[PDB]
Amino acid sequence: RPARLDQLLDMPAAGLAVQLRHAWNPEDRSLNVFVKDDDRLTFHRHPVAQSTDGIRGKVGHARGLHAWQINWPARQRGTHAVVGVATARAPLHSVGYTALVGSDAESWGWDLGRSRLYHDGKNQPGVAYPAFLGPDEAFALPDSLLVVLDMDEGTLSFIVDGQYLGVAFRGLKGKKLYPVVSAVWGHCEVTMRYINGLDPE
């Protein structure tokens, strides 16, 4: 576990105003999702058939270390629940049911149902994550996970059950990366709670 990750997580968690600044962006989304007015940290996906829909956080990170919590109820995932980061150019919708995040060079995602990492996924196969998993093996992840973006080292990592799962992706330095997810489940509600950020030393 990196020393800086321990430093970020030992800090008191950021308050509501900071969480709202880093929440889902009602202006940067598929039209098939909306940000809930009574809980602006959560979006709701309309029950549209044969559609995959995403949304980005309001803040695109270009430097520093950042962590946010995703709460995605396990029975609201369906065939394709993907969590990760994207540039501003990543598409936020596809026809059909797809792992939209990680499907091209503009995003990096963890397909929760397959326990596979995708980046430029049309060209590159998925990577088993967590590491313990065999080639045809997946793990049923709990509702909550932490997403850790290190823009200075250029890495994305995850923490599940308080266990750091290691670097999932590298090569992110010099970009401007937003939290993102892609969803397919009718009426799913996914919450994102920014925890903290830490400037490089």
């Binding site: 065939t79 394709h80 797809t98 792992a99 149902g113 397959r114 996924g121 049309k122 196969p125 998925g126």
Partner: peptide, 7 residues
């Protein structure tokens, strides 16, 4: 290599 074994 999608969910339905199609790449």
């Amino acid at each position: 290599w999608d969910i339905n074994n199609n790449x």
